[PDB]
Ligand binder design. Sequence first.
Ligand SMILES: Cc1occc1C(=O)Nc1ccncc1
Length: 434
Amino acid sequence: MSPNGNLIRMLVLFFLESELHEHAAYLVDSLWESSQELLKDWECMTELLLEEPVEAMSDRQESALIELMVCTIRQAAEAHPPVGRGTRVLTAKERKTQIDDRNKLTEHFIITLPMLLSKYSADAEKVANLLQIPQYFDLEIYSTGRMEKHLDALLKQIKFVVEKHVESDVLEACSKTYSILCSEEYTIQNRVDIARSQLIDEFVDRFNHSVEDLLQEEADDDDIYNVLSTLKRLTSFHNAHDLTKWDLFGNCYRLLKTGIEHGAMPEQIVVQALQCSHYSILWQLVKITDGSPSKEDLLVLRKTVKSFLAVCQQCLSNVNTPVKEQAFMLLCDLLMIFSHQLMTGGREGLQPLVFNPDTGLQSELLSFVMDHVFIDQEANKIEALHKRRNLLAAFSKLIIYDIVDMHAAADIFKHYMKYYNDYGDIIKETLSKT
Ligand SMILES: Cc1occc1C(=O)Nc1ccncc1
């Protein structure tokens, strides 16, 4: 009870103080054969986190307990070592345990996860880590346990969280949590759908008034905060939720047009308005793949796509390189999606939606690569390199399927590989003689 609480308090200290385990997931996995009983005392944990002391817990150790708690909850639910330690056939008794564990952590965390979110509402890192939990719930128990009350509680708290936060980690964690609760059962489906589309509506109104405030305006620092703040939330959700019924593309399109014309739109507002527009378009495509869509259906989406390909192209010329990257990424996505590939799986109705990038665009997709993939000059650089890598791999796809001139490409890859082709073999010797 407090005998387990001491063992957990010390286990959190051995993790932080000793870089003998870097990764929580890996620590827990290693101790799992040997200390399963302790690592699934979930009441003991939620207690430590929620209770006031009689030695108090410091911000950093709390964070660590929460991260270890989630890792235990996974390993119990999945009943297999995490990604990186995997090698998968359970015995009668292993399976029987998995079922009993899942029941325990669900019954428990349904009750307690709302209270954890409550208490730690402003700690983005903590909230995002906590919201990884419902994915492991036996969601049917929101009916079985007559536990309707606690589902309202969770939803009340996910509201507070979205209303308080703008970090893309938190928001995404909030979007995924809805997707999980929202479609997993029918019993609960209806309830969640309502909470969601209320949450949305509130943020579309704010966004829309915020858009108007800004474009009508001299433009206040607040005018800029309000537009961005709301957009971010809607962009986050628009990935896994189909918000097409609210014409978001419309207002994003204006934001982007104003930033090109008068050239004075904040860089984060542009990037978000780009991403949000893209998500608008993919969900427009999905409805039009699955329906039996008419002529005008197609042609109205086409104009939307060309008017947007235009915006992304123009946005390559934005001063702020983050814009350029977003611009580029969406161009290299969209040009691939709205290729002739779109007439695979018998879907040759979609011919009018196909796009071939003109010369001027192809040349600017060659530009960016020389200017922003292949550049002259800690952990911010290994993360920066993997991105230019993705920007290039996304550009690679366009070259292979002849959507940009495959020879103009090759000549840039020639130019920058020059020293590998000129002096590489003489480097080869070196790393076999030293
Ligand atoms: C670091 C590196 O990256 C690519 C090539 C090399 C390289 O040549 N390293 C080296 C040269 C001479 N002695 C020892 C090592």
